[PDB]
């Protein structure tokens, strides 16, 4: 359609395409400001490289490939709670 282009585009739609909303949507961080703080401390990455700014509208494929950065204490306690740490990957 084009009526979705004249009406469906919203400040709410672009702000939900923003990065910490996507992290909360993928349930990485429980709260939006916690997602912000994790992006500040540098515990997330998008594909190859990591991201430090919250104002980052993540593309479709890249939100498909977003994850934590490796060897970070948050992923370490994830795998510790799941009891599946593997220090060959120094997870």
């Amino acid at each position: 359609k084009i009526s979705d282009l004249e009406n469906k585009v919203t400040v709410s739609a672009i702000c939900r395409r923003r990065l910490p909303v996507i992290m909360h949507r993928l349930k990485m961080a429980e709260t939006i400001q916690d997602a912000v703080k994790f992006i500040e401390q540098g515990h997330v990455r998008v594909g190859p490289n990591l991201i430090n700014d919250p104002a980052y509208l993540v593309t479709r494929n890249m939100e498909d490939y977003v994850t934590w950065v490796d060897n970070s204490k948050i992923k370490k306690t994830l795998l510790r709670y799941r009891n599946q740490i593997d220090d060959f990957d120094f997870s």
């Binding site: 990485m28 948050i74 510790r80 799941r82």
Partner: peptide
């Protein structure tokens, strides 16, 4: 429940993840 376990998405970080017989009962 089977659908949720199919879409677990294993990167979820929630902050909660940082945590005689009568004589035996009385002693415990």
């Amino acid at each position: 429940l089977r659908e949720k376990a199919k879409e677990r998405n294993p990167d979820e970080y929630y902050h909660a993840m940082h945590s005689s017989m009568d004589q035996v009962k009385l002693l415990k």
